Amino acid sequence: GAMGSMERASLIQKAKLAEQAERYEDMAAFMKGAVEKGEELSCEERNLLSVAYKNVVGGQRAAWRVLSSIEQKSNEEGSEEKGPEVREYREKVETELQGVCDTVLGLLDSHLIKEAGDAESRVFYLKMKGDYYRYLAEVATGDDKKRIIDSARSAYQEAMDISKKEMPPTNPIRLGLALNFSVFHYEIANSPEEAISLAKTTFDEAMADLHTLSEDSYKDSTLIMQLLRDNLTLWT
């Protein structure tokens, strides 16, 4: 399957090389290969997967927004017809974005999530699942936009339920999940009060648990807590 003939460990090794070379498409292809070997991923391996795809879809999203914005301007009063080109190219980028999202969601469904028993692995994958439906939701306008939104909410919510049960409030994955879910509420679900409440509660419970941490953990937790604070500053 492109990568079916390369060793798992070589795929991982090359994923790290690709990251150092800022070759995120290669990185993604390599970790896709790795995943398709059928073995569970270690913590570090989960991060490599996540980072690879986040960079790919991130480039796609930034491009989409640029084009979507040109498109919206062109469809204004006094704007001159330029032809179908802007919409065509926006659609091409969009199609390629969706393909990537479906690919990640595919890997999560076949079979990362059902094999993830530990809180840290399961929450990590459900977070990803919520993220990749959220990215689909950003560009969605059709019969199943709401279903797409609900798919995100549902993956996020299950992640949260487990995270609240199994992880301390300062757990970086719990924190990043809550950050992202609160962005979902604000940007996707039209629920800015939910967004603000989640971010606030998350920040305060974490604050109260920092005393239990080592210096290295403290640095990990406070970094994400600062992202929660930045959002709150913007939103309030």
């Binding site: 490599l48 950050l179 992202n180 994400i224 930045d230």
Partner: peptide, 9 residues
């Protein structure tokens, strides 16, 4: 509104 940058591993 910032999500996890998650860009460097």
């Amino acid at each position: 509104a910032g999500s996890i940058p998650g860009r460097r591993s």
